[PDB]
Amino acid sequence: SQGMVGQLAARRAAGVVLEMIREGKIAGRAVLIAGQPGTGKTAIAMGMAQALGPDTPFTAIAGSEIFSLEMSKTEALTQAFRRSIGVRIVSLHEIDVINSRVREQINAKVAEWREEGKAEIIPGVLFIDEVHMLDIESFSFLNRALESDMAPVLIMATNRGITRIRGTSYQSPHGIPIDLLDRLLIVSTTPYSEKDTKQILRIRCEEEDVEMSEDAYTVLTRIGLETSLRYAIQLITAASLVCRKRKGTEVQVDDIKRVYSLFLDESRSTQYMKEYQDAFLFN
Amino acid sequence: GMVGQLAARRAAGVVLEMIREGKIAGRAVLIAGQPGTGKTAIAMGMAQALGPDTPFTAIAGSEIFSLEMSKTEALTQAFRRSIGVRIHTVSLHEIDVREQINAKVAEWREEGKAEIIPGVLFIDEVHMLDIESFSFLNRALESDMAPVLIMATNRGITRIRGTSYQSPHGIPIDLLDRLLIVSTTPYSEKDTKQILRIRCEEEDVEMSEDAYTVLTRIGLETSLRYAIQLITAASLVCRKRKGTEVQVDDIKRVYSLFLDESRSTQYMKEYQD
Amino acid sequence: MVGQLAARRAAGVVLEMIREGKIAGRAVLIAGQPGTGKTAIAMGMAQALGPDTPFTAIAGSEIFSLEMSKTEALTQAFRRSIGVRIHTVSLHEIDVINSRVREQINAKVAEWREEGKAEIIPGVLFIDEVHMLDIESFSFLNRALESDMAPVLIMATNRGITRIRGTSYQSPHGIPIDLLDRLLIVSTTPYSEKDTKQILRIRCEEEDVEMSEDAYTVLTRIGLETSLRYAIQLITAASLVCRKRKGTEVQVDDIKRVYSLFLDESRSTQYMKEYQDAFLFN
Amino acid sequence: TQRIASHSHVKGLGLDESGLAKQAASGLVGQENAREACGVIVELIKSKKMAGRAVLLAGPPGTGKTALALAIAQELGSKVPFCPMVGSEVYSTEIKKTEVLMENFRRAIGLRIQDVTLHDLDGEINKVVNKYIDQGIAELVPGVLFVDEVHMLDIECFTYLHRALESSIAPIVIFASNRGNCVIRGTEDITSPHGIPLDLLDRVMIIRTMLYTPQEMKQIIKIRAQTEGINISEEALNHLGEIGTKTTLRYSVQLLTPANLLAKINGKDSIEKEHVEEISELFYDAKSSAKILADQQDK
Amino acid sequence: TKTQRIASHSHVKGLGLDESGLAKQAASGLVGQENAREACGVIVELIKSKKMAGRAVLLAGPPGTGKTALALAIAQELGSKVPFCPMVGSEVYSTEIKKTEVLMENFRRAIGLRIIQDVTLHDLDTDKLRGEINKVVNKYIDQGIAELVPGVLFVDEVHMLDIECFTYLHRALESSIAPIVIFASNRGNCVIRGTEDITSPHGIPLDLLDRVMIIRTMLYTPQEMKQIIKIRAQTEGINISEEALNHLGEIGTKTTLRYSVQLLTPANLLAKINGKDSIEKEHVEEISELFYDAKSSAKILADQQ
Amino acid sequence: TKTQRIASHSHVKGLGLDESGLAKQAASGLVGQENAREACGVIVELIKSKKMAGRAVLLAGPPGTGKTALALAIAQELGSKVPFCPMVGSEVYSTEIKKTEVLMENFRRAIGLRIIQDVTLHDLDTDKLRGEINKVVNKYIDQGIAELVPGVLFVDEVHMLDIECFTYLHRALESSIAPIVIFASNRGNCVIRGTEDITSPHGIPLDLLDRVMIIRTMLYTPQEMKQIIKIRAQTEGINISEEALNHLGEIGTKTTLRYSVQLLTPANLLAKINGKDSIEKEHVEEISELFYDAKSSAKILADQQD
Ligand SMILES: Nc1ncnc2c1ncn2[C@@H]1O[C@H](COP(=O)(O)OP(=O)(O)O)[C@@H](O)[C@H]1O
Ligand SMILES: Nc1ncnc2c1ncn2[C@@H]1O[C@H](COP(=O)(O)OP(=O)(O)O)[C@@H](O)[C@H]1O
Ligand SMILES: Nc1ncnc2c1ncn2[C@@H]1O[C@H](COP(=O)(O)OP(=O)(O)O)[C@@H](O)[C@H]1O
C-alpha cells in the first residue's frame, strides 16, 4: 500500500496531523519524528506531504547540511521555508533568484497577489533532517518563521537522546530548547521486527530487477534484523554478482554467507580494532 | 549616612589623608566586602569628605562586557570621568583630538579659571575585568591625573579572567602588592535595627517595636535587601486590613509569600532532583 | 663533533642516499634530548654535503609570529634552503631582486635548467623543535617538498608520543602518522664520562680557560648530574672569580663556589616545591 | 497571538475584596498562595510604588508561571500591552542580542485618543513621549514583559536590562526560571540563583509557584476544553489528570486538539477514555521520548 | 601528476585473480590477502556492470597491511592508465586554498575523459567551473562520440577529515559524473571532526556510511612478511639474502611492514659502502640499530624524561 | 620615563661589595642575602669584561626577598644614570599597543648611549625603523667616541609573558646592541602561556633558558627582616621604636616583606591623626588589624562563605 511498509501506528499518527491542517489547528505547532536510524523517519514525511493535495511542495534538508560555505544559514533557512510556499501555474525559492538577482518586497507583493488569485497560497510541508546537529540561533529563526500566515508545516527528525544543545552547556531532551520542545509532537517510530524486514528485502529486490530464492530471504532476514536494513540491501546487489559468476539462475544461502563473510556491516569492523589495540595500546 | 562599621569607617579616614599628603600616587583601595554590606557609600565616604566638588563615577566590573563598543575605549571614558577642572568643576569627558585635550589642559593649569583636581573612581564587581584591563589600570594610574581608585569584590581565591592561574580577589599580583585592602565586617543585630528604622521612615511607614525584633531576626540570615523588599509590601497588606500600622503577624504573612534567594534555590532542589 | 658514534654513522647513510637520488620523497628526524647537538649533526649534512649548500636553522617555536602568517615563515625558509648557482645565490634572494612573485620565477629558474648557465643546487632545511607545529602547517611539508625544486628536510624533537596541535589524536613526536611513514629517524645518545671532557677541553679553548684536572673531573661530575647547558655556563663564571687572586688555573673550590652561586635549571625549581608546594599545606 | 492562545481563559487574576485568593475564579484554579502574591504586585503598580524592580516566578515548568503574566496584564487595566519573549528568542545572528531584547521592551509600554505602544512610534525618541506627559495628553500605561527561560539570557544583555529598567518610563518585567543555582551564561565561571546575576537580583521579588494535584489538574483541562468547545468526559479527563501529573500540564493541555479530532476521525464529537488511551501511545511527551532513544541504543 | 606517492606501489600489476573470481596466491604483484582480494573482485565487477550509483568503499585495516595497494589494484583492474589520485586526510588543510576546493582538486582528478586526447575533468582547467563543465560532458556522452572513464579517488587517514568535507563529498556523489572514492582507516570508534562532539565508527558520519561497503584486511603472518619484501626488492634491484630477509621479516612483525620496506634502500646503500653488493645480515642489523621506528623512538624519549 | 616603579626602592645605592669578591652584613642600602649579592656582583663583573655571551639573569625566589632590589643594584653598579625600566609579566597585553611593540619599547627604554649628551634608543623614537637605527648606530660606535652603556631590563613575574613574546626576545637579545635583561619569577614548573602542556622551569621556554643563569634569593630571618624596615624608615624621615620593628618584622615573617613596606606610610599617618610623635606598638596594631593583605584577606571571603 503506497510504498510505505510497516510503522502502522506512526503512520496513523500522521493521519491525526493530516486533519489538524485541514481543520486549521496546526498554525504554530510543529511535528518531530524520533527513532533509531534506518527506519523510515526520512520517509514518513513524503507520504505525509502527498496527502495535502496533488502538488504540495516538499524540501527535505539536513541539519549537518547547514555548514554551507557559499550560503549563510540566515539565508539557507530563509529560502528553505520559501521552497514550501504554494504558487499555482513554482515556489518562492526560485522567484527571488531570477526576478531579483527583497524578501519583504515579494511578501508585500504577494499581499497584492492574494486578491487576484491566478496563483493561490497553499503553503506546504517541510522536512529538516537531523535536527540534533542544528545550532541554537537557527532554532530562534524557526520561532520567527512560523509567525506568518504563509507558514509551512515544519517536520523535524532526531535520533539522539538527552544531549546538549548546539550552542550552550545545558543537557536537555532531544537537543532542542524547551521553547519549541514542549510545543512539538513526537511521532515515534519503532525498529522493525523479523517479519517486517523481509518484505522490504522483497521490495528492494523487486525494483532492482533481481530474482531471489526463498531460502536466501530468511538468512538475509537474520542479518537484516541484526545489523541493519541498509547493509542488507548492499549485500543484495553484491550477491547478484556472485550468483552471475557461476551464472546462478537464483541466489542462494552460501551466495550470501560468502558475501556476508566477504564484506562487513557497519558494526563488526570496529570490533576487529577493539582486540587489535590490546597489546598495541596496553603495553 | 552610615550605620555601624566601627573599623572600616576608620580606615576611610586614614586613606583620606593619603590623598591630602600626596602619598597615594601609585596605590589604590580594595574593599573586600560581602554583597550586602554597603561598600558603595563607603566609596562615597571619601567623596563626601575629601571635597564637596570632587566628583565620582560608579561603573560595574561587568559593565565593560560591551557589544556596541570595545572593552577599553569604554573604560577610558569612565576613567577620565573622575578628573575635573574648576570653572562647576567640569569633567574631562564633557570636553570631548584625544591627546590635544591632554595637551591643551597642560597649558590651562596656571591661568586662574582652570585648575586640575583628582577624583574618586569606583569599580565594583572588579573580578570580571580581565588581564587586558588590569594592564590598563597598571598604566593609567601612573599618569599625572591619578584618581583615587576604589575596587570592590566578593570573590576569594579565584582564577583571573584572561589567565588561568590562582589569585586573590580576581586581581593580578602587579596591581595587588601595593594595595590597601579594607574588610567590611557584616551587619549585626543592633546594626540592623538602626538601618531598618531608617528605611521605614524613607517610605512613610510607622512600624512596631516588636515586628522590628522579628524583621531584624529575619533580616540577618537572608539579606538586608530582602528585608527592604518586604517593608514596602508589608505596608500595602496593612493598607488592605486598614490598620494604619504594621505588627508582628504582618511580616510572616508576606514572608510566606515573597521568598528570598536561599529558600528559592532549595525549593528548586526539591523538584529538580 | 666529538661523540655521536651511533648518529653520525647513520647520518652518513642519510648522506650517500642523497647522492643516488633515493632520498626523493623522504625526510630526516633527529630524535633526542636537547644539548646533544642536534643542530651539529644536522649541519654536518651541510658541511659534508658541500661547501656551497644553503642551510637554515629555524626553530619550530620560531614560527609563532604575530606579524607573519602561517604560509610565509616556511616559503621563505625553503627558498632560503634551495639555491641557484650562477658567489652562489639562494633562491629567496632572487625574489628580492624581482620585487624592488613565485608565479613567474619558478618557471624562469626552470627555464635555466635547459641552458645550465644557472644551475640549481639541492640544499638542506633544518626545522628544530618541530613538535610545536600543527597540521595546518605540517600539510605544507607534504605540499612543497614533493616538488622537484626541493631540499632535504631535517627535523628534531625531544617530545615523545604527544598530542599534535590542531586535533586531539596523539602520535609519536607530534607529527602526523602519514608523515612518519617516510621519516628516517636517527637517535642521539647521552654523552659519556670520558667523552664529556672533550667538549669541556674544547670550550676551555674558546676563552683560553686554564683548568685544574680535579676541576675537570668534578665539572663532568657536575655536568652529567644536571646538564651540559649548565656546565658550559660555569666556565666563564669560573674565570672572573679566579681573577681575584689570579689563580694561574681555576681550582676545585673555585668551581665549587660558583656552583653554589648559580643554580641549574632543575635543582632551582626544586626549591620552589620547598616554597610553593610547602606553604599551601601549612 | 498564538503566544497567548494557550491562555485564552484568563479574564482576570480572580481575587476577592479582602485581598485574599479564592480557588476557582476567572479562569485560574489552584495556586492560592502565589495568587495572593501577584495580587500584591498588581496593587504595587496601581499605587506607582514599584520603584524599579521586577518579579521572578520560581518553580517547576507547566505549573502556570505564564498564566499569571497574562493575569497581571489583565488586572492592571486589561488594555495593557503584553509580549511574552523567551530567552532563546534573543540568540539570533541576523540581529544583535540587545535590539531584539529591546524590541519587545519597547512594545510593552502602552500609551493613550488612539491606543498605541512605543514600538509603533519606534534618546530623542525617549523625550517627546516624556514631553506628552508634561502636557497631559497621553499617559503611559506600563504593560507586562514576560521573559521566560531567563537562564538563556547572558550577562552581556542583562546589564543592558539593568540600564533600560533604570530609566523611569520602563514597564514591569516578569522573569520565569525553572532551574536552581545555575551558572550564568556568557561568563563561564560565576554562579547565581536562577541564572540571574547579583546586580539584577536586587530588583526581583521571588514569588514561588508550586506544583499541582490531580484534583487541581482536572479543573483546568476542563476549562481549556470548554473554551475551545470540545466536549470531553470525566473518565477521559481523569486520564489527562494522570498524564498531567505524570509529565507536565503543558503536555496535557496540548493533547486536547488532536484527541478531539481522533473522535472526528472516528465520527464522534466527544472525547472518551479509549481515545486518550490511544493518543498517549501515538504522541509522546519530550522526556520519555529521549528515554526510548536511551533504550533502543542501550538495548 | 605526482609520480612519487605510488613509487612503492610500482610492483602491483592488478589483483592476481582467477577466472571465476577467486584470488591466487602470488600474481600481478600481491602475496596473500586473498580473503580481501575476493572482495576487490566483486567490487570491480560492479563498477564495470554499472551497479555503482554513487557508492564508496572503506578498507579498514591496521597500518602496514596493504590498504593503499589494494586500492591501486581496483584502479588497474578497471583498466591500465586509468586515473588514480591518492590523497591523505591531513592534506585538505591548506591555509592558502579553502579546504572544500582541495577535495575538488582530487575528486575531479580521478576521472578519465575520453574524446584521442585523454584528460581528467580537473585538468580541463568557481563553482561555475565545477557546474558548467558537467553539462557539456553530459552532452558529450549522449553525442555518441565522447565518454568518461571513471577512476579511483583514495582518501587515507580519513579521521582527520572534518564535517565540512564529508557533507560536500557526500553531496558531490549524487552527480552522474562522479568517480568512485575509496576510503581507509586504522582505528575503531573515533569522534568526528568539524563539529568535535560525538563518536562515530572510523570517523565516518551516518550520512556517508550508507554508501560504505567495508572490506576488512587482516594482518600478515611472518611468511607473508617475506615475499612482500622480496617483490619490493626485485623491482629496485636489491640483491638480498634469505638469512637477512628472515631478519627483515622479523622487523615487519616487530613493528610494521611499511617501516620494514623503507629500510631497504638505506640498507642497500649501506652495503654499497661496505662493498658487498648483495645484502647480508651484518648490514640489516646495523641499519635497524642505527635507524629507528616511531613507536620505538617515542619510547626512548620516554626512557629518559 | 617613570619614577614610581623605582621610588619604592629609592634606598639601594649599589650592591655593597668589598673588593675581596664578597659582601658584608649590610651596606649601600642592602641587607642580608649574602649568597645572592655576590652573584649579582659576578654578573656586573661580566658586563665589564663583556664575557656575557648573549646571556641573561633569572632571579628565582619567593616574593618578598628583593628581586626588584638586587636587579636595581645591578643597574646602579654599572654607573650613575645607567637606564633601568622594570616591567611585569602582564605588561605586554594592551588594546592600545600590541605585544611585540611594548616589549621593544621597554627593550629600547634600557639601551643607553653617550653621544656629550645622554641618549637612549627609545629617545630616538615599525621594526623596519628599528633595524634602520641599528646599522647606523653601529657606525657611531665605530667612529670611536659614541660608546654605549647597556641598561638593565627587569621582567618581574616572567610567567605571564606568553610564548609569542619569548621567541621575539630570543630574536632580539641576540643583537650586539642588547641590554642585559633580568627575568624574575617564583612560580614552579609553569605552563608557558600558549602551549598548554609544557612544564618548563619558572615559565621560560627551553631555548631561551639556554641563556639565563638562575640565582636563588633566600627568604630572610626575622633578625635581618627588622634591619631593612629600619633602613626603609630612615630614607622617609619616619621614626620608629624598637619593639614596633619587633612587631612589624614579626608580622612580616607571618605574611611577606612586600606588605610591611606598605605599612610605614599609613602607620606614620596614624600618628599624624592622633597627634603622636612617631609610630609605636599600638599604632601598628591599629593598622595591621585594620588594613589587610590579599594572601590573608582572601581567607575571610572563604570563612564567611563557609
Ligand atoms: N493556575 C492556573 N490557572 C489557569 N491556567 C493555568 C494554570 N496553570 C497552568 N495553566 C495553563 O496551563 C498551561 C501551562 O502553563 P505555563 O506556565 O504556560 O507552562 P510553562 O510553565 O511551561 O510556561 C498554560 O497554557 C496555562 O494556560
Ligand atoms: N598484499 C600486499 N601485496 C603487495 N604489497 C604489499 C601488500 N601489503 C602491503 N604491501 C606493501 O607494503 C606497503 C604498505 O602498504 P600500504 O597500504 O601502502 O600501507 P598500509 O598497509 O599501512 O595502509 C606498501 O608499500 C605495499 O607496497
Ligand atoms: N635585602 C634587601 N635589601 C634592601 N632592600 C630590600 C631587601 N629586601 C627587600 N627590600 C626592599 O623591599 C621591597 C620589596 O622588594 P621587591 O623585589 O620589589 O619585592 P619582591 O621581593 O616581592 O619581588 C623593595 O623595594 C626593596 O627595596
Numbering used by the authors:
A (entry chain D): 58 to 146, 157 to 168, 187 to 368
B (entry chain E): 60 to 146, 155 to 163, 187 to 363
C (entry chain F): 61 to 146, 155 to 168, 187 to 368
D (entry chain B): 26 to 137, 146 to 155, 188 to 364
E (entry chain A): 24 to 138, 146 to 155, 183 to 362
F (entry chain C): 24 to 138, 146 to 155, 183 to 363
From the paper:
RUVBL1 and RUVBL2 are two closely related AAA-type ATPases that assemble as hetero-hexameric structures made of alternating subunits and comprising six ADP/ATP-binding domains. RUVBL1 and RUVBL2 contain a unique domain II (DII) that protrudes from one side of the hexamer and defines two distinct faces of the ring, named ATPase-face and DII-face hereafter. Each RUVBL1 and RUVBL2 subunit contains a nucleotide-binding pocket and the adjacent subunit in the hexamer provides the arginine finger motif required for hydrolysis. RUVBL1 and RUVBL2 are essential constituents of several large complexes.
Here, we demonstrate that RUVBL1-RUVBL2 hetero-hexamers can bind directly to DHX34 in vitro and in cells in culture. DHX34 binds to the internal regions of the DII domains in the hetero-hexameric RUVBL1-RUVBL2 ring. We first analyzed the structure of the RUVBL1-RUVBL2 ring using a mask that removed the influence of DHX34 and the protruding OB-fold domains during image processing. This way the average resolution of RUVBL1-RUVBL2 improved to 4.2 Å detecting the presence or absence of nucleotide in the nucleotide-binding pockets of both subunits. The most striking feature in the cryo-EM map is that the N-terminal regions that contribute to nucleotide binding are visualized in RUVBL1 but not in any of the three RUVBL2 subunits. We and others have observed that RUVBL1-RUVBL2 co-purifies with nucleotides bound to all six subunits, but whereas nucleotide remains bound to RUVBL1 in the RUVBL1-RUVBL2-DHX34 complex, this is lost in all three RUVBL2 subunits. The structure of the nucleotide-binding pocket in RUVBL2 is not altered significantly with respect to the crystal structure of RUVBL2 bound to nucleotide. This suggests that it is the displacement of the N-termini of RUVBL2 that is mostly responsible for the loss of nucleotide. Thus, DHX34 regulates ATP hydrolysis of the RUVBL1-RUVBL2 complex mostly by changes in the RUVBL2 subunit.
